[PDB]
Amino acid sequence: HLKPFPPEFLWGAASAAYQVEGAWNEDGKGLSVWDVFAKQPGRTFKGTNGDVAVDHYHRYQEDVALMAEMGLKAYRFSVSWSRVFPDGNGAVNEKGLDFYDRLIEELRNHGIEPIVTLYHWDVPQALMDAYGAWESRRIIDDFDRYAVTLFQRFGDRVKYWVTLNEQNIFISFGYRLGLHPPGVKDMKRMYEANHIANLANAKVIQSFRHYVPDGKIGPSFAYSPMYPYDSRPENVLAFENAEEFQNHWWMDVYAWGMYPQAAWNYLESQGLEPTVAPGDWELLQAAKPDFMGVNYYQTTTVEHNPPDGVGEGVMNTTGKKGTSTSSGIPGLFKTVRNPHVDTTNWDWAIDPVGLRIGLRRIANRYQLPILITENGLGEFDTLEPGDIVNDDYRIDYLRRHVQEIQRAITDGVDVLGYCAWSFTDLLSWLNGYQKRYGFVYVNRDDESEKDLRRIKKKSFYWYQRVIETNGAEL
Amino acid sequence: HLKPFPPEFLWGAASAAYQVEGAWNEDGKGLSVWDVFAKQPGRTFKGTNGDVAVDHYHRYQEDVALMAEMGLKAYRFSVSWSRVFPDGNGAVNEKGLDFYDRLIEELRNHGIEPIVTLYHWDVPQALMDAYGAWESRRIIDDFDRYAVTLFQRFGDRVKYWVTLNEQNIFISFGYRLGLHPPGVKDMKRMYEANHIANLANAKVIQSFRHYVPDGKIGPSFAYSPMYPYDSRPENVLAFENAEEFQNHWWMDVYAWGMYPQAAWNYLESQGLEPTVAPGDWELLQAAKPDFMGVNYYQTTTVEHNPPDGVGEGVMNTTGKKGTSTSSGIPGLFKTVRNPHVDTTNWDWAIDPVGLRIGLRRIANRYQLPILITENGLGEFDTLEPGDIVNDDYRIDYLRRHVQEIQRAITDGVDVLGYCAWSFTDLLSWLNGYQKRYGFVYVNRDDESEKDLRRIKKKSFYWYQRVIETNGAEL
């Protein structure tokens, strides 16, 4: 006897600006850290970059009408800070704001709720040049200026706002693994940049309470809930260490304004804990969000990792199955394959019960409503003659996840909406274009833009039916 | 690399009044529910009861001397409400108080820190007769007045207090399994009494803040940390339900003053949730403790339990190994033996790492300092020629748990103290005397009451040494 999806439930889809828009140098846009980074040889699969992407900047009207045909209730998109401030903190580029105003008016004329993400990884390069972007306190008031600019221009028409999208990923990939700008591999630097970003998050939520008093705002955390391998007590302890270090490290700051203490102590023992200024704890504790945004693709299984043990591991970016290997922190935990679920070709675990677990943990720990800001399956799609894309595998993966969402609602979790990643196919940051996530196929590949034509996948019509029935038919 | 135990670490040992005191009808002592219950034939192994026990009411001076010789920094005991108010709510019994006053002066004069437990399961039978005891709100101001009397008489000499001891055990065993007074098997009544015990806990903490401003107080919870059997997602989900239902159900009320929602909603849907009055939440939320008390003996591993599957199961109090059977809640979870630890012959888990996990879960979820109020191993001891009890099995169990406490302190958990269970052998509630927990053997069995002479076991000398080396030598 399941609860129904509430009447307001935001059935959505999502994108990110640098992955979709193109027009990387048009209408006064400044360079972002991604415009520069993806151009350095070797950084991205086959040198793929966002100069054009799938040209959503020019094609937004076509894309929006396709959202209207699907009947989408909400659209989640990111604003590119370099179009608004080409030098990050100078004078506003009105042409930049005018694209987003055009896009927002298009959505509202079709009855679609905009969900605006303030930051999806594309800090302007000028700020990196000036003071090292996220590594400097100067970015707090710079992000603030930007965010208020958007709050004052669009706050009357946008109620739902996301602050930092997957801060855990952009910080860790940019400063620990070196895979994303600025390409640094330095844990001390990572944790310092992380602290600054936590302060910037708080500062903008606070500003939001003044400028958009009737809006709702949250960060969007990349959440992979941890499991222990088994009931061996050392494996369970690994699970405690992992959930704390990977998930609580961020979500507790978001919900409570405090870092967990075991993880803090372990960092301190290693000289890695961030520098804290007078007033930091106060700011962080006073920035309560309306919801926890959750981007969910998979759970992670862990086991005991001796101090002489596994550290960085191999990340599958090819799409050859079986190629990833264990990653962890020596002495705390390492990952291991969950033998009780299937994986993708990119070795991502398929675990829709995991999403129920994840949503249950957040309610249980923080008592927060959740907006699911991303969930999706990336796979090769074949375009068959007659402009046909049979993506049964995507429908299956989305069906099972939406089913478990309802179970969670039934359990008592306040879930505000569900945004599938992605609306159209788009550019993956490191893996090019062939790992497709859209409801709408874009005719291009890694070698050619072809005509970038939009072709509705079978999953398009499945989700249209889900939305028309408010989830009752899956 | 281990931190040492702090310099003021309360190395302790513990008892419960009914289990140790006797003098069941002396100096004005009223009847307790256990005096009555235990006399009913069937209830207790071979009719054993607390009329005499180990006669600590008469031999306390010999008992505090053996403490001083061991060098305990603290002793945890419970006050019998029926020595103080024979009627529960009538006139004060100055002689009942005088006994506790003599115990505390004895302890102080050997520089031992008294830890006073207000309630260990022995409400005056007169309150059960007048109004159902814990099933009535009337027990709130009666328990309060009792507590306030103790705080007024002893607060200047006792800094550490426990409020309700193992509340989950006296409620469950007393109102669901029917093994303790009042002998009931009714979940609705269980949860009502549970809720009233919660308000009583809170009310006495709020009194304590006024009467003992420089003191420290908290409840003590009987904690078996739940583990998932494996990384099967349905088993992890089972663990989420089990830890919330079995553990958070109590600890979140103690720390935060709120029940968890998924558990509450499950009860609400069975008709089982308690009755709430105006002011309940405000009082519960305003009763922050200084610490969380923890009674730990073992972890519990769980797995998926179908809606039709296992319910209440078979306990093994007989001591023959292998006879316990799975206990659970259909739909949520059921227990299963953990194949990665050994058990006792009572099918209890031997899992010292389990304690560190537990301590880590409390600091992580609540940020509270922990007082370990009970841990110990029960076994048969043989008295051998020359007054020698070679309790190696017990030393070994206790050593591993103290080793793991050190690791937790090193992880950054604030552990205030550790009270082994128990100082002298004592009366078990239901199983008699033969499963011994003491450092000090007491000469009596289930049949022959002999002379009750105190004989130091091998473990007494072990623990004297632990305390002498502040934990350095284990």
PDB file of N, CA and C in Angstrom, chain B residues 251-299:
ATOM      1  N   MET B 251      17.990   6.382  21.812  1.00  0.00           N
ATOM      2  CA  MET B 251      19.080   7.374  21.887  1.00  0.00           C
ATOM      3  C   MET B 251      18.730   8.736  21.271  1.00  0.00           C
ATOM      4  N   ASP B 252      17.991   8.743  20.168  1.00  0.00           N
ATOM      5  CA  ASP B 252      17.587  10.056  19.601  1.00  0.00           C
ATOM      6  C   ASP B 252      16.661  10.780  20.516  1.00  0.00           C
ATOM      7  N   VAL B 253      15.812  10.071  21.271  1.00  0.00           N
ATOM      8  CA  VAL B 253      14.976  10.771  22.259  1.00  0.00           C
ATOM      9  C   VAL B 253      15.845  11.333  23.350  1.00  0.00           C
ATOM     10  N   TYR B 254      16.806  10.548  23.801  1.00  0.00           N
ATOM     11  CA  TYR B 254      17.723  11.094  24.857  1.00  0.00           C
ATOM     12  C   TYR B 254      18.570  12.293  24.407  1.00  0.00           C
ATOM     13  N   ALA B 255      19.118  12.238  23.171  1.00  0.00           N
ATOM     14  CA  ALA B 255      20.047  13.307  22.672  1.00  0.00           C
ATOM     15  C   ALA B 255      19.337  14.522  22.104  1.00  0.00           C
ATOM     16  N   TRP B 256      18.331  14.234  21.281  1.00  0.00           N
ATOM     17  CA  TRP B 256      17.635  15.255  20.511  1.00  0.00           C
ATOM     18  C   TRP B 256      16.205  15.521  20.960  1.00  0.00           C
ATOM     19  N   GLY B 257      15.577  14.571  21.644  1.00  0.00           N
ATOM     20  CA  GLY B 257      14.214  14.781  22.124  1.00  0.00           C
ATOM     21  C   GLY B 257      13.155  14.552  21.064  1.00  0.00           C
ATOM     22  N   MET B 258      13.417  13.625  20.139  1.00  0.00           N
ATOM     23  CA  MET B 258      12.498  13.371  19.051  1.00  0.00           C
ATOM     24  C   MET B 258      12.656  11.920  18.700  1.00  0.00           C
ATOM     25  N   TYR B 259      11.563  11.257  18.343  1.00  0.00           N
ATOM     26  CA  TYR B 259      11.664   9.877  17.785  1.00  0.00           C
ATOM     27  C   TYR B 259      12.015   9.902  16.302  1.00  0.00           C
ATOM     28  N   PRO B 260      12.679   8.852  15.782  1.00  0.00           N
ATOM     29  CA  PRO B 260      12.861   8.763  14.345  1.00  0.00           C
ATOM     30  C   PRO B 260      11.548   8.513  13.565  1.00  0.00           C
ATOM     31  N   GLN B 261      11.429   9.109  12.383  1.00  0.00           N
ATOM     32  CA  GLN B 261      10.153   9.140  11.639  1.00  0.00           C
ATOM     33  C   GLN B 261       9.767   7.849  10.994  1.00  0.00           C
ATOM     34  N   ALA B 262      10.691   7.165  10.373  1.00  0.00           N
ATOM     35  CA  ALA B 262      10.306   5.946   9.734  1.00  0.00           C
ATOM     36  C   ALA B 262       9.778   4.942  10.764  1.00  0.00           C
ATOM     37  N   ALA B 263      10.426   4.900  11.935  1.00  0.00           N
ATOM     38  CA  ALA B 263       9.956   4.015  13.010  1.00  0.00           C
ATOM     39  C   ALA B 263       8.595   4.507  13.487  1.00  0.00           C
ATOM     40  N   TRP B 264       8.463   5.798  13.766  1.00  0.00           N
ATOM     41  CA  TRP B 264       7.198   6.330  14.221  1.00  0.00           C
ATOM     42  C   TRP B 264       6.045   6.039  13.269  1.00  0.00           C
ATOM     43  N   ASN B 265       6.323   6.193  11.971  1.00  0.00           N
ATOM     44  CA  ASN B 265       5.315   5.966  10.939  1.00  0.00           C
ATOM     45  C   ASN B 265       4.971   4.501  10.889  1.00  0.00           C
ATOM     46  N   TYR B 266       5.932   3.594  11.076  1.00  0.00           N
ATOM     47  CA  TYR B 266       5.600   2.159  11.091  1.00  0.00           C
ATOM     48  C   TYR B 266       4.660   1.829  12.258  1.00  0.00           C
ATOM     49  N   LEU B 267       4.994   2.331  13.434  1.00  0.00           N
ATOM     50  CA  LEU B 267       4.105   2.205  14.597  1.00  0.00           C
ATOM     51  C   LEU B 267       2.728   2.819  14.317  1.00  0.00           C
ATOM     52  N   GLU B 268       2.686   4.050  13.797  1.00  0.00           N
ATOM     53  CA  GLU B 268       1.420   4.767  13.546  1.00  0.00           C
ATOM     54  C   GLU B 268       0.499   3.944  12.672  1.00  0.00           C
ATOM     55  N   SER B 269       1.101   3.175  11.778  1.00  0.00           N
ATOM     56  CA  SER B 269       0.352   2.373  10.851  1.00  0.00           C
ATOM     57  C   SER B 269      -0.108   1.055  11.454  1.00  0.00           C
ATOM     58  N   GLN B 270       0.517   0.611  12.559  1.00  0.00           N
ATOM     59  CA  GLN B 270       0.064  -0.558  13.333  1.00  0.00           C
ATOM     60  C   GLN B 270      -0.892  -0.166  14.476  1.00  0.00           C
ATOM     61  N   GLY B 271      -1.145   1.126  14.668  1.00  0.00           N
ATOM     62  CA  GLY B 271      -1.904   1.610  15.803  1.00  0.00           C
ATOM     63  C   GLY B 271      -1.117   1.659  17.102  1.00  0.00           C
ATOM     64  N   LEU B 272       0.217   1.559  17.019  1.00  0.00           N
ATOM     65  CA  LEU B 272       1.044   1.363  18.207  1.00  0.00           C
ATOM     66  C   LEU B 272       1.728   2.616  18.764  1.00  0.00           C
ATOM     67  N   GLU B 273       1.576   3.780  18.135  1.00  0.00           N
ATOM     68  CA  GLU B 273       2.392   4.913  18.537  1.00  0.00           C
ATOM     69  C   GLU B 273       1.845   5.441  19.815  1.00  0.00           C
ATOM     70  N   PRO B 274       2.691   6.058  20.652  1.00  0.00           N
ATOM     71  CA  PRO B 274       2.186   6.589  21.898  1.00  0.00           C
ATOM     72  C   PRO B 274       1.329   7.820  21.761  1.00  0.00           C
ATOM     73  N   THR B 275       0.676   8.118  22.865  1.00  0.00           N
ATOM     74  CA  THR B 275      -0.181   9.239  23.013  1.00  0.00           C
ATOM     75  C   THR B 275       0.623  10.425  23.426  1.00  0.00           C
ATOM     76  N   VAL B 276       0.447  11.533  22.724  1.00  0.00           N
ATOM     77  CA  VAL B 276       1.238  12.698  22.993  1.00  0.00           C
ATOM     78  C   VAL B 276       0.366  13.822  23.497  1.00  0.00           C
ATOM     79  N   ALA B 277       0.833  14.514  24.518  1.00  0.00           N
ATOM     80  CA  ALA B 277       0.125  15.659  25.055  1.00  0.00           C
ATOM     81  C   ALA B 277       0.877  16.950  24.787  1.00  0.00           C
ATOM     82  N   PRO B 278       0.169  18.087  24.866  1.00  0.00           N
ATOM     83  CA  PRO B 278       0.783  19.388  24.851  1.00  0.00           C
ATOM     84  C   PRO B 278       2.004  19.412  25.733  1.00  0.00           C
ATOM     85  N   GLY B 279       3.116  19.934  25.239  1.00  0.00           N
ATOM     86  CA  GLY B 279       4.295  20.103  26.097  1.00  0.00           C
ATOM     87  C   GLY B 279       5.256  18.934  26.058  1.00  0.00           C
ATOM     88  N   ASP B 280       4.829  17.808  25.505  1.00  0.00           N
ATOM     89  CA  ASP B 280       5.672  16.636  25.528  1.00  0.00           C
ATOM     90  C   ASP B 280       6.993  16.938  24.790  1.00  0.00           C
ATOM     91  N   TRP B 281       6.896  17.530  23.605  1.00  0.00           N
ATOM     92  CA  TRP B 281       8.090  17.674  22.778  1.00  0.00           C
ATOM     93  C   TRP B 281       9.007  18.714  23.374  1.00  0.00           C
ATOM     94  N   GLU B 282       8.442  19.803  23.875  1.00  0.00           N
ATOM     95  CA  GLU B 282       9.208  20.883  24.505  1.00  0.00           C
ATOM     96  C   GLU B 282      10.021  20.405  25.712  1.00  0.00           C
ATOM     97  N   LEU B 283       9.415  19.537  26.522  1.00  0.00           N
ATOM     98  CA  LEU B 283      10.105  18.958  27.654  1.00  0.00           C
ATOM     99  C   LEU B 283      11.189  17.992  27.177  1.00  0.00           C
ATOM    100  N   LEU B 284      10.866  17.077  26.267  1.00  0.00           N
ATOM    101  CA  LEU B 284      11.841  16.090  25.773  1.00  0.00           C
ATOM    102  C   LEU B 284      13.038  16.723  25.080  1.00  0.00           C
ATOM    103  N   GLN B 285      12.793  17.835  24.400  1.00  0.00           N
ATOM    104  CA  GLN B 285      13.833  18.487  23.616  1.00  0.00           C
ATOM    105  C   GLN B 285      14.725  19.283  24.516  1.00  0.00           C
ATOM    106  N   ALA B 286      14.192  19.700  25.659  1.00  0.00           N
ATOM    107  CA  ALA B 286      14.945  20.529  26.589  1.00  0.00           C
ATOM    108  C   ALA B 286      15.713  19.744  27.641  1.00  0.00           C
ATOM    109  N   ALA B 287      15.849  18.434  27.495  1.00  0.00           N
ATOM    110  CA  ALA B 287      16.571  17.634  28.505  1.00  0.00           C
ATOM    111  C   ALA B 287      17.914  17.050  28.007  1.00  0.00           C
ATOM    112  N   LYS B 288      18.827  17.926  27.627  1.00  0.00           N
ATOM    113  CA  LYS B 288      20.121  17.489  27.084  1.00  0.00           C
ATOM    114  C   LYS B 288      20.974  16.853  28.200  1.00  0.00           C
ATOM    115  N   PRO B 289      21.466  15.648  27.993  1.00  0.00           N
ATOM    116  CA  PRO B 289      22.308  15.090  29.047  1.00  0.00           C
ATOM    117  C   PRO B 289      23.782  15.470  28.910  1.00  0.00           C
ATOM    118  N   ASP B 290      24.567  15.301  29.971  1.00  0.00           N
ATOM    119  CA  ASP B 290      26.008  15.529  29.893  1.00  0.00           C
ATOM    120  C   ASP B 290      26.700  14.373  29.213  1.00  0.00           C
ATOM    121  N   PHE B 291      26.138  13.184  29.291  1.00  0.00           N
ATOM    122  CA  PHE B 291      26.754  12.060  28.633  1.00  0.00           C
ATOM    123  C   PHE B 291      25.713  11.080  28.256  1.00  0.00           C
ATOM    124  N   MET B 292      26.124  10.130  27.442  1.00  0.00           N
ATOM    125  CA  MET B 292      25.317   8.980  27.194  1.00  0.00           C
ATOM    126  C   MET B 292      25.927   7.816  27.908  1.00  0.00           C
ATOM    127  N   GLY B 293      25.118   7.147  28.734  1.00  0.00           N
ATOM    128  CA  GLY B 293      25.536   5.899  29.378  1.00  0.00           C
ATOM    129  C   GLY B 293      25.336   4.759  28.470  1.00  0.00           C
ATOM    130  N   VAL B 294      26.281   3.848  28.475  1.00  0.00           N
ATOM    131  CA  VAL B 294      26.253   2.732  27.602  1.00  0.00           C
ATOM    132  C   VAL B 294      26.565   1.427  28.334  1.00  0.00           C
ATOM    133  N   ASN B 295      25.614   0.486  28.228  1.00  0.00           N
ATOM    134  CA  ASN B 295      25.774  -0.891  28.682  1.00  0.00           C
ATOM    135  C   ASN B 295      25.931  -1.709  27.472  1.00  0.00           C
ATOM    136  N   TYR B 296      27.101  -2.323  27.327  1.00  0.00           N
ATOM    137  CA  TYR B 296      27.441  -3.045  26.130  1.00  0.00           C
ATOM    138  C   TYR B 296      27.874  -4.404  26.480  1.00  0.00           C
ATOM    139  N   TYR B 297      27.397  -5.385  25.729  1.00  0.00           N
ATOM    140  CA  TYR B 297      27.845  -6.751  25.853  1.00  0.00           C
ATOM    141  C   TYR B 297      28.104  -7.384  24.527  1.00  0.00           C
ATOM    142  N   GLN B 298      27.361  -6.958  23.490  1.00  0.00           N
ATOM    143  CA  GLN B 298      27.459  -7.609  22.189  1.00  0.00           C
ATOM    144  C   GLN B 298      26.795  -6.798  21.055  1.00  0.00           C
ATOM    145  N   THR B 299      27.195  -7.128  19.833  1.00  0.00           N
ATOM    146  CA  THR B 299      26.563  -6.639  18.609  1.00  0.00           C
ATOM    147  C   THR B 299      25.540  -7.634  18.104  1.00  0.00           C
TER     148      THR B 299
END
